[PDB]
Amino acid sequence: KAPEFPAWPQYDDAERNGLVRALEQGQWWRMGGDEVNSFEREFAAHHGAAHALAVTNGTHALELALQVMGVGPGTEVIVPAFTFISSSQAAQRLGAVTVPVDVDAATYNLDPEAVAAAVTPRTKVIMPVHMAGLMADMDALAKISADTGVPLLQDAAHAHGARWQGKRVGELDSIATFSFQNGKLMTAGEGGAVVFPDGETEKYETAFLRHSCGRPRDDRRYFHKIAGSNMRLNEFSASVLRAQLARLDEQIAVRDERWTLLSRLLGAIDGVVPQGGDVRADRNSHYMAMFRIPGLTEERRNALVDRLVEAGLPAFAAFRAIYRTDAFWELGAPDESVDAIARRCPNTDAISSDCVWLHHRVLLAGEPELHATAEIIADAVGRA
Template sequence: MSSDPAQPVLTFPAWPQAGAEEREGLLRALNQEGWWRNGGSEVDSFESEFAEVHGAPYAIATTNGTHALELALSVLGVGPGDEVIVPAFTFISSSLAVQRVGAVPVPADVRPDTYCLDIEATARLITPRTKVVMPVHMAGQVADLDALAQLAEATGVTVLQDAAHAHAARWHGRRLGEFGWMAAFSFQNGKLMTAGEGGALLLPDEESHRQAYLRHGCGRPPGDRVYAHLTQGSNYRMNEFSAAVLRAQLTRLEAQIAVREQRSRQLTAALSRIPGLVPQGRDDRCDVKSHYMAMMRLPGVTPGRRTAVVDALNAHGIPAFVGFPPVYRTAGYWQGPHSGDVEEIAKRCPVAEEIGGDCVWLHHRVLLADAATVDRLAEVLAEVVART
């Protein structure tokens, strides 16, 4: 379906956004003696600033968000023989990171309203081999951290937050670094702040920070000059140029979230009136939702019709995408450590099965548009869903 020539193509703010702050930061990094973290100051400064915004004692900047998850799992001692419970509906990095450290990702179902991890379903999957539960704050909606805290206390498992979508989000007014758990973030090109690629890991105490620092730099301690590789690790270090850009991006983050919050409420109210379309729900205990995506479902849609809807929206200038398949519905999942089979997992994850087949999402830049454009976006969505 092509766009209606009588209707103008909608225009949204560009992403990524950059200004004088990024240019100044890049020149600042360029003019240093070194361009890697051990020769400059941009990564150190970014880690301090990012940790402060998120209420964490420490942060480590990494090459990307997947590596931030791998680093966290390594610090937590996760390895072969261990199990990590992950949402069945998430981007593949959540399960991939588990497999890359040799452990088994165990998919659990998600909630039909928020698309976040279902804690009751998670509790049923805990075994003596379960070492970590990894909630994903889907599209910036924080998972139920109250229930997760109760589960962790009752079972002794550790919580690792996959916060790739949830920069500066809050739960009951608390920032994600204030819960005593690690939280991993992504700065990939489409994320809420970006340097094209990059990641960060929030750390709750000095010892976890020390271990993360060692492991993200091939096991070398700060200031090492004798190749003292004290532990296993890899090279997950962020470079100075990425950190300089992210320092600038961080200064805009909370103001952009405030705009997205207003536009999201406007858009959600409009989408709720469209027959055959159900927007992602919200748990009001998440009092700052960062709105990485505007997600919605088309219950009962066929794969072909969903693709046609997405194509039609893109023809109107709306950056739309199909939702993630359940992780166990990808070929890559079965090439790493796993247990069970597709149909067994699907049977216990009926909500993820449905959302994986009928979800559509819009890039968060649509929520940085003016109110009139968001109104027109909702009208186009209604027209496309009705006609396609």
């Protein structure tokens, strides 16, 4: 029969006790308990960050980080055109213009040359996404950052526990955001965080204020200081996140061994090219096991996904080019046309139609199951 992969999410007594501990504090919001506060320190420490701010979800961690980095009406935000819609939707929500840029053909990370060209006097932030756990070129990006003076924002939703040139997400000198959505590498069904490197304490304080209806942590008289929203995380969610956190490093360790095996097996299938590597990214979190089948239309790629699901695999189409979603064109759209953005985003334009991913739970399975998985793929790709 079909191969079997470990469940996701996973839990055990840590989660069980955590939810009880949160419950029995008798206070369920961060102002009366200690679960969110403790999770923030544990999360930040794990990432080498000066501070962490746990929030309702990864899309709001992006909206908050952008907002304290000055994003707003009149500004532009550069984002990879290949990514989950939240990456641009967040800038759109703040009234800014999202400027989508091409990505690398092999890693699928934001392309540095492409961003250098898209820079403008309106650019307020450049947002690399560490695609499927593989960091983007933070050196090349950091250099464009200095030359232009446009700060970087890492969309680290796929990269919990990732490392670039030995450095943790939070030791790269830029703010970064995470997601704890159900399918993420650690999860409480929903959740997010904003992590602030050493030197960004002010933005951290402002972020706290904007995430709590502009209210000082100790205000009693409703002296709301600035605009914002409520993006507070509850204590129940925080306690489940603290148990997830504790298995993260080792889960990533099993995935790194398993991807080594799968990448090679896949790269052996004619027509099939697994996501590329980058040796400066010393610790790839392995959020997705991604591969292209260059030349496939969307419809053939979609049909192949369906055959893979039918054969017992947790396989998906990969992200749609963000300029090909209606959502993107509803507000803050760039003056270009759709073909004009596609013309300068040829890698996105193809990966949008030919890239497949399997759930990161496959990368926890045994070697036998990865062999069985790649046979299934090899057969199905013959018929695609």
